[PDB]
């Protein structure tokens, strides 16, 4: 049967799908067992919440302190609680979270995100907070009046101790680069005092808040790549 | 008979208008261990959008379906030291960092394997290099646990009668083979929090369940007047994969090939203050 | 004994044939065409179903 | 109300008037081994009620400086009632567990605890390339203390809290089944852990099926009160337990 | 016809199945004859009994002595007859038996085993014996009270001169390694005096017992390997 | 017409409860030469178990279906001794120990054969090695019994007109061929307890029935200015196998290629005493 | 003239085609798909059938 | 089922006779921006002609469906400078003039890609060249943006676990692969009249949208006693092409690889006068 | 799963078969058999249709 | 399956049409968008008018 070899023959492509001979002919495999916890897609992992280390103050002698956002009883009428860049795969805040780790194995991402805040103060304490997301622009907000123009939610602390801020997917392109640059910016997220925290007598004067990050049901990734967080110099 | 014939896009956004009611989707309680299922449509007005994005590339089958190097070693065609003319490697996936981390995201795995071998040769430097040598040939032998192990390049054990082997000649395509699921248990285990002896003593960790055998390589009969060095690289490519019980990715650098030992590491990098955004 | 199935393309704007040559199922090519998934296992592990609209507690 | 729960196992009952929902493993309820999945041939023994009951595993003290604790199972119940005896006399074992953690404080206290069950919680030694005995990681029901600073003693495990002694980020443990005890709205966390292993049954003296971890993510704080610490109690109840291969007692 | 060669071409795999040309074209083969004793599976051989050399006392000047287990008339009320490890492919006792030889060509094994004991004493002699199998544990039994807790059978010597002890397959894994280690132990087997041996006047004061080993109908092996018992240094 | 289309697990355990009766499955009598057919269900209470294990890998077809080396020899392209420039091997399967023992587990065999040849070359050491030689070519010739035998590398007999032969060039895949069942009898015989002469004299043993012929190999026309040495390895792979009358495996080491001679060997290893179990 | 038959897989959780190119049956591939066996030849070579439950003699 | 089955000539001339009427097809007005649709039949008597000419070869698919070199570079097997033993090229189509001009006739493009690699080697000149080296092998690695970048030939990054790679041996056919449409936008953009920062500052032009990654190449393990130089050429071949918004072809010579900078050029050549026709 | 289609020839004075081997549509061969075209987009971009015979204005 | 290679094997012809493996398996492409001004044949461009520089007077 006449034949002609085309270019690419005898090459080894690491991502090919070809049949090959079996070295252990007629090997009987062990019967399957339905172990609990089967995972069929990394996105299922990506959708689980994880604590975000927002308090990266360059002076954290205690590592666990990075997870707590300080709050005080007597604050200037309007005062910023925190601010951060929305770069889930590049910013130091999201770099090592359960979501950031998955993204670092890819190059493109798209979809919305969830940020959940939980108040871990006393039961008698109360307050209100304004959390706003500012799409990309030439300047990040500096005061509450600037922040309130963008997407935001007013959070009231009560019996329900958690509030969810859904960051919508507002972008000019269907996808964004994990190694984000100026062209594919995503904006900023900030939190401000809405009313202030009030406490009765006989309670601590300070409290803390924690943030959780996760992906919505429309999130996706593409173009698999090798992560840069792990490296070696010599064979183990 | 002659022929028998044999896609799931992400969820679409839905138009949402102004609302004023007692329902409060935004408020929840993380204490239950339950992740909120809210969507942007539940907190802001949204337009109708049809999404054609698909999560095809995030499947475990595709995530692990890439060949990765797992071991590389050098052996010479001729030398004074007998042990230096052939390789003997106990099979294990903990030698190379990248694939080790990739696999260690799951506790239990069950997959078929595809093995590819890349072999290259080079002439050692010396004062006299003028020689003519025909093409070289190499032998790869797999020894299940407990089988005889050769002690020299020209040992009798190299006459495999039951042990599978491959003979390869330089200049052709790399050798390849397939391996089924060959674990005594129902699934491979990346971690094992236990001991070997029933009295809670002896070996500890995943080193106890590593009994996959050995691999040996040699030059079939090449023995040049001058030394020639060869290097072999082994690549693994899981197929038909299933995984269970996801785990958090490793944060600290690896330090041992058969242990979890590590050094404490900071959680992440630092910035000027909590408000710095530039 | 040939299987005919569709191949990956695009939304708005396509068949390939496959035949097995070896007697061992381990020799087949990767079956990377499955896209079923269910995240409720890890996101909703609670016993009592919670309605998103209703208060959590 | 949905803040009231009651659990009845064997001849013991647990009542909580202030609790959140109940987390069920990976959505799988504990169950007995099926006929088409077993491997051992002889008849098993199902000492129901005698072994399927709650067992209070001692109690710790939560201070302002506490860092966390961990327990390993089933070794923690190695000497608790008939469960321990049956464990000693049988070669193979298999059972799910129900973990209930109690921690109550006034409406003027503040703090947050993370309760998580980590299956296959392998741990690394304090000094890389230095072995430890089976006494620096499990010695019965006693709780082990995490450390804020890096461990230096070569005879024990690396207790650096931020790495969870497994060389991973502490904040990512949410992936495993878990619940939070927030003093503002919760006093107890309940987790139903099914049997997870690569084999239908396993020796219960050689293998630690899973590890429980309680980590204060927000340190306890209070002011002007006579209460100096908040005790924390753990209670565990094996479920659908069955043994196999009777032999002399270990 | 365009084509491309994939990796693995021109390789020689010792366990491949490919068609090749015939060098003796149209050769007429001799007609077949149904010789008695056709064997279609090595397990059929493995199921046949064979004498086990249990008496490996390091002082056997006579090799045939290894096959006989001594027994005496006046023994301490309780006394052990013999003890051995259940490692069919590794223990010296089972290493060279008809079953051990087959196993040494493989790596994994599973299933139950049969041990048959035959009393070769006088016709007037009588006695009872306890044979027990102890699954894996931290310590082997030391006395009859310890042994009787595990699986065992009481053997009565009478007209029927043979008794069978069926060792059940109790293991955590579907398979066990032939090169057994601590992880995949199998236990121990021991025999003890139940009542003692009594003889009338005019009979020998000593007797012997023999043991036979074979596999049940649920036995299996997998992963073919090269046996280590045979070796050569030079071409014959 | 265009297509025409064309599994036996081990026996399952069955639930057994307490029993008290006159039946005594445990008791038997080995004097009959009959192996007891008892099962664990007949002596102890057991649960119901479904076994999916299969004995596929224990079949004789698979047991013997592995290629094994049977002979290796060296010949030079140029030398003074004529006999040293080519090989002449009488076919026999008793040369290599491993496959010999594998085959000797059965008394009579009947199978097709698949033969593969592996050839490698190397330049002999010397004071001057600088030369250029094109690729070499080799000829393999099979001579049924009684045919002419070459006496030198350039003999006329190398012009095979009826004797099958293979010409092979270095750098390509190893040569291969198939051989049908070519025994005058109804089956190959590994053992033959008899003599050659009818008066019970002459040759004794399996040496009498070995009349399979010879194999010859040479360099087609290569004759380098400097010596070059080549080595050939022959591999046999039975196909479509049938066996009869199993025999006990050999215990003593082999000592002759055409005899059963041996030296007495201990039955097995020793231990401290009959009770030692550690 | 193509044969289609099943390939080895697993119990709980599959066709290949074969064609012969040579005129000699000795050229075919190994027929390692047969799993029939009968051990009664070597384990029960007696003349009179013995019931396991009944006494041997 | 077994088989499923699946041309437009230019317009023909039509007989035209003498005419005398008020209709004036010849007269029009270009001010409307409309190109006249007149035909020779509308101004002169013509015969009937059947045209079989077809515009098959003018389709965009065929116009762009030719492989063209886009980059060439040299690397040595051994040298003192570490940076000189491997290549690192940021992907871009502006390096070679011919294909750049071909692509720049359209503003937006959307196509699949076919990549072919041609590799050749040569021995560097020197005072001593006598050596023997087996065949060389080469590795090509593709790093999407943001991935780790090797810093030396023997860096750990060369153990690709997710990054696709090709291993190629000299003497065989050139390597080839296919690449789908991998742009974040809906189509590739040859031009971009805009800035990077929202304040209209920073990078300007098509340099802003070039984020396709890098390509790395090295000798797998070859390290000769004497230097050997290799050259690699990359060829691109668009497939399944679509184009939008045609533009006028470039008149001035290119001068920068990432800019439109140019020098003024005359419109065309000159002649003696407006009437010269010789 | 084989496609049969005509090949380029001449006016006055012819089938080939194609089969896809890979699961990705990007691996197919160039589809250079399409010859549809419409120049009115660039030659007649006006709003009101103009008849060639009639005066332009 | 016996086969014989014909002349032209292993050659690289710049105008060939052959299938090749995909390096980015199961990559999801961006949805298509109907941008105005699609061109399907260079002749469409060739049919558009353009100013002719007739006055090439060398001065
Ligand atoms: C710790 N991991 C557990 C999973 N295991 C998978 C695995 C299983 C078998 C092989 N065999 C490779 C091979 C091929 C050909 C001849 C001999 C061989 F050993 C590879 C990986 C990897 C280790
Ligand atoms: C003692 N054993 C008896 C069985 N016999 C099997 C056998 C039969 C023929 C061949 N021919 C090998 C061959 C191939 C090609 C050319 C010439 C040849 F001799 C091999 C084994 C082996 C010896
Ligand atoms: C400026 N032009 C835009 C269009 N782009 C087309 C294009 C897209 C991808 C590739 N990939 C080439 C490649 C193949 C294999 C491995 C790595 C690779 F980068 C080429 C061209 C070209 C630039």
d(CA A141, CA D166): 40
Show me where the domains of chain C are located.
1-57
CA distance F150 to F86: 10
> With contacts defined as CB-CB under 8 Å, which chain E residues touch B145?
107, 177, 179
List, edge to edge, every strand of the sheet that includes H137-143. Answer: A12-13, H165-169, H137-143, H214-219, H87-90
The alpha carbon torsion through F139, F145, F148, F149 (nearest 10 deg) reads: 60
CB count within 10 Å of CB A3 equals 14
Q: Are the beta carbons of G3 and F28 separated by less than 8 Å?
A: no
CB distance F129–B220 less than 8 Å? no
CB-nearest to D246 from E141, E146, E149 is: E149
Does residue A51 have a cis bond before it (omega within 30 degrees)? no
Chain B hits for C55, CB-CB cut-off 8 Å, are: 24, 27
- CA D197 – CA B248 distance, rounded (Å): 18
Which candidate, H139, H127, H228, H222, places its Cα nearest to that of B123? H222
Decide if I25 and C32 are in contact by the 8 Å CB cutoff.
no
Q: What is the number of residues in chain E?
A: 236
> A27: closest CA among D119, F56, F133, H254?
F56
Contact exists between I and G (3 or more beta carbon pairs < 8 Å): no
- How far, in Å, CA of A6 to CA of J16, rounded? 10
CB F47 within 8 A of CB D44: yes
Residue B177 Cα distances to A19, B219, B260, H161, angstroms:
9, 20, 31, 19
Give the best residue of G7, G21, G35 to mutate against chain C (max C CB count within 10 A). Answer: G7
Count how many Cα atoms sit within 13 Å of the Cα of residue D230 in the half-sphere of its side chain.
26
Residues 6+ apart with CB under 8 A from B229: B74, B75, B76, B77, B121, B122, B123, B124
In C33-52, the residues whose Cβ lies within 8 Å of chain A are 34, 36-39, 41-43
Q: Which ligand is nearest to the CA of H145?
A: 3
> Which of C40, C42, C47 has its CB closest to that of D21?
C47
- For D49: left if phi > 0, alpha if psi spans -120 to 50, otherwise beta; the answer is left
Residue H137: which residues within 8 A CB-CB, separation 6 or more? B118, B120, H167, H168, H169, H170, H219, H220, H221, H222
CB H209 within 8 A of CB H91: no
- Distance from C-alpha of I11 to C-alpha of I2, rounded to nearest angstrom: 27
Residues 6 or more apart whose CB falls under 8 angstroms from that of H273 comprise J57, J58
Contact (CB<8Å) J27/B62: no
Helices of type H across chain D: 81-89
**Rg of chain E in Å (alpha carbons):** 24
Task: Residue C32: list chain J partners with CB under 8 A.
Answer: 25-26
Ligand 1 interacting residues, C-beta cut-off 6 A: A 23; B 91-93, 113, 115, 142, 177, 179, 182, 188, 212-213, 215, 236
**Who among J26, J31, J32 is closest to C8 (CB)?**
J26
Residue among A215, A211, A136, A214 at smallest CA distance from A173: A136
Cα separation of D171 and D167, whole Å? Answer: 12
> Based on the number of CB atoms within 10 Å of its own CB, is H257 exposed (0-12), middle (13-18) or buried (19 or more)?
exposed
Residue F168 backbone dihedrals phi, psi, to 5 degrees: -135, 145
Domain ranges of chain E: 1-236
Q: Please give the distance, rounded to the nearest whole angstrom, from the Cα atom of residue H244 to the centre of ligand 3.
A: 19
Pocket of ligand 3 (CB under 6 A): H 91-93, 113, 115, 142, 177, 179, 182, 188, 212-213, 215, 236; J 23
Grouping H, G, I as helix, E, B as strand and the rest as coil, residue E175 is coil
Which residues on E lie below 8 Å from A2 (Cβ)?
1
What residues pair up with H140 in beta bridges, in sequence order?
H166, H217
Query: Quick one: CA dihedral H126, H128, H130, H136, positive or negative?
Result: negative
Report the alpha-carbon distance of residue C5 to residue C15 in Å, rounded: 6
Expressed in Å, this structure's resolution amounts to 2.8
CB atoms near residue H138 (< 10 Å): 21
Spatial distance between the Cα atoms of F116 and F234, rounded to a whole number of angstroms:
6
Distance CA B66, CA H164 (A): 8
CA F58 to chain centre: 17
Under 8 Å between Cβ of F104 and F188: no
Interface contact flag, C17 I22, Cβ < 8 Å: no
CATH architecture of D1-250: Sandwich (2.60)
Q: Assess contact for B274 and A55: CB atoms under 8 A.
A: yes
The answer to whether D246 and E150 have CB atoms below 8 angstroms apart is: yes
Strand partners, H152: none
- Who among D21, D185, D192 is closest to C48 (CB)? D21
- Least CB-CB distance to A23: which of E3, E5, E15? E15
Residue nearest to atom 4 of ligand 1 (CA): B188
Residue of F36, F182, F187 to mutate, interface with E, max E Cβ within 10 Å: F36
Q: Residues of C with CB below 8 A from I20's CB?
A: 7, 15-17
In a mutational test of the D interface, the residue from C39, C45, C51 whose CB has the highest number of chain D CBs within 10 Å is C45
Helix H or strand E segment including A146: helix A144-147
- The answer to whether the CB of H259 falls within 8 A of the CB of H205 is yes
CB contact at 8 A, H239 and H181: no
Do the bridges between strand C2-6 and strand B3-5 make them parallel or antiparallel, or are there none, so unpaired? parallel
Cα separation of E173 and H114, whole Å?
Answer: 50
* Residue of F113, F168, F186 best suited for mutating to test ligand 2, as the one with most atoms within 8 Å of CB: F113
SS3 category, J12: coil
Distance CA H67, CA H69 (A): 7
Give per-residue burial for B205-228: e unless 16+ CB within 10 Å, then b: bbebbbbbbbbbbbbbbbbbbbeb
Residue nearest atom 3 of ligand 3, based on CA coordinates: H188
E67 touches chain D (CB under 8 A): no
- Domain covering E1-236 assigned CATH 3.40.50.700 in the classification: no
Ligand closest to F175 (CA) is: 2
Half-sphere exposure of residue F259: CA atoms within 13 angstroms, side-chain side: 8
DSSP label of F157: G
Homologous superfamily of G1-57 in CATH? Answer: Picornavirus coat protein VP4 (4.10.80.10)
Phi/psi at D193 (nearest 5 deg)?
Answer: -95, 115
DSSP A202: S
Distance CA D130, CA D155 (A): 8
Distance between Cα F169 and ligand 2 center (Å): 24
**How many Cβ atoms from other residues are within 10 Å of residue F205's Cβ?**
18
Cα D28 to Cα D9: distance, rounded to the nearest angstrom: 18
With CB atoms and an 8 Å threshold, state whether I31 touches H23.
no
Experimental method reported for this structure: cryo-EM
């Amino acid at each position: 049967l006449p034949t002609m070899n085309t270019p690419g023959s005898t090459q080894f492509l690491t991502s090919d799908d070809f049949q090959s001979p079996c070295a252990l002919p007629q090997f009987d495999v062990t019967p399957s067992m339905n172990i609990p916890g089967e995972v069929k897609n990394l996105m299922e992992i990506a959708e689980v919440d994880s604590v975000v280390p927002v308090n990266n103050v360059q002076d954290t002698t205690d590592q666990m302190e990075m997870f707590r956002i300080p709050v005080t009883i007597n604050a200037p009428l309007q005062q910023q609680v925190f601010g951060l860049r929305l770069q889930p795969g590049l910013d130091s805040v999201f770099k090592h979270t359960l979501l950031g780790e998955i993204l670092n194995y890819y190059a493109h991402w798209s979809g919305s995100m969830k940020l959940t805040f939980v108040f871990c103060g006393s039961a008698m304490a109360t307050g209100k907070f304004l959390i706003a997301y500012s799409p990309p622009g030439a300047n990040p907000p500096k005061t509450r009046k600037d922040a309130m123009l963008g997407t935001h939610i007013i959070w009231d602390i009560g019996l329900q101790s958690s509030c969810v801020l859904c960051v919508p997917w507002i972008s000019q392109t269907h996808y964004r680069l994990v190694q984000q640059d100026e062209y594919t910016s995503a904006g900023y997220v900030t939190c401000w005092y809405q009313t202030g925290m009030i406490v009765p007598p006989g309670t601590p004067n300070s409290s803390s808040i924690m943030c959780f990050a996760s992906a919505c049901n429309d999130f996706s990734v593409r173009m698999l790549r090798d992560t840069p967080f792990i490296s070696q110099d010599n064979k183990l | 008979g002659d022929v028998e014939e044999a896609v799931v896009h992400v969820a679409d956004t839905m138009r949402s208008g102004p609302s004023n009611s007692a329902s409060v989707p935004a408020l929840t309680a993380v204490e239950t261990g339950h992740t909120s299922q809210v969507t942007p449509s539940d907190t802001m007005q949204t337009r109708h959008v049809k999404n054609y994005h698909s999560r095809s590339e995030s499947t475990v089958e595709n995530f692990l379906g890439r060949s990765a190097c797992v071991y590389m070693e050098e052996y010479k065609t001729t030398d004074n030291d007998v042990n230096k003319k052939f390789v003997a490697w106990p099979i294990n996936t903990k030698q190379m960092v990248q694939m080790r981390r990739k696999l260690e995201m799951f506790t239990y795995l069950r997959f078929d394997m595809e093995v590819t071998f890349v072999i290259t040769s080079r002439q050692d430097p010396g004062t006299t290099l003028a020689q003519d040598m025909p093409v070289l040939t190499h032998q790869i032998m797999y020894v299940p646990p407990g089988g005889p192990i050769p002690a020299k390049v020209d040992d009798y054990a190299w006459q495999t009668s039951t042990n599978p082997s491959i003979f390869w000649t330089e200049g052709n395509a790399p050798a390849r083979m397939s391996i089924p699921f060959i674990s005594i248990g129902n699934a491979y285990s990346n971690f094992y929090d236990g001991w070997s002896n029933f009295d809670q003593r002896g070996s500890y960790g995943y080193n106890t369940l590593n009994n996959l055998g050995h691999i040996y390589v040699r030059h079939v009969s090449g023995s040049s007047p001058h030394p020639i060095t060869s290097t072999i690289r082994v690549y693994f490519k899981p197929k038909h994969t299933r995984a269970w019980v996801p785990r958090p990715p490793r944060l600290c650098q690896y330090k041992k090939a058969f242990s979890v030992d590590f050094t404490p590491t900071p959680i992440t990098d630092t910035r000027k203050d909590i408000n710095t955004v530039t | 004994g040939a299987q005919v199935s569709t191949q990956k393309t695009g939304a708005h704007e396509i068949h390939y044939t496959n035949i097995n040559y070896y007697k061992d199922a381990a020799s087949n090519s990767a079956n990377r065409q499955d896209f079923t998934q269910d995240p409720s296992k890890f996101t909703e592990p609670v016993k009592d179903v919670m309605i998103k609209s209703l208060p959590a507690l | 109300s949905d803040r009231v729960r009651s659990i009845t196992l064997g001849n013991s009952t647990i009542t909580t008037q202030e609790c959140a929902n109940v987390v069920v493993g990976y959505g799988r309820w504990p169950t007995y081994l099926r006929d088409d999945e077993a491997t051992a041939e002889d008849q098993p023994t199902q000492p129901d009620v005698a072994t399927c009951r709650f067992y209070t595993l001692d109690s710790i003290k939560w201070e302002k400086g506490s860092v966390g604790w961990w327990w390993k199972f089933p070794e923690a119940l190695s000497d608790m009632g008939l469960f321990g005896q049956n464990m000693q006399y049988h070669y193979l074992g298999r059972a799910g567990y129900t973990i209930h953690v109690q921690c109550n404080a006034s409406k003027f206290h503040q703090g947050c605890l993370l309760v998580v069950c980590v299956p296959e919680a392998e741990m690394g030694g304090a000094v890389v390339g230095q072995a430890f005995s089976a006494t620096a990681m499990a010695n019965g029901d006693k709780a082990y203390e995490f450390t804020s600073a890096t461990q230096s003693d070569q005879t024990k495990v690396q207790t650096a809290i931020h790495n969870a002694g497994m060389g991973v980020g502490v904040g990512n443990l949410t992936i495993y089944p878990h619940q939070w005890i927030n003093l503002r709205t919760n006093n107890s966390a309940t987790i139903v852990m099914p049997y997870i292993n690569s084999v239908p049954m396993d020796n219960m003296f050689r293998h630690y099926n899973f590890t429980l971890m309680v980590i204060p993510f927000v340190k306890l704080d209070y002011a002007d009160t006579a209460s100096t610490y908040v005790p924390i109690t753990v209670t565990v109840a094996p479920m659908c337990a069955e043994y196999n291969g009777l032999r002399l007692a270990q």
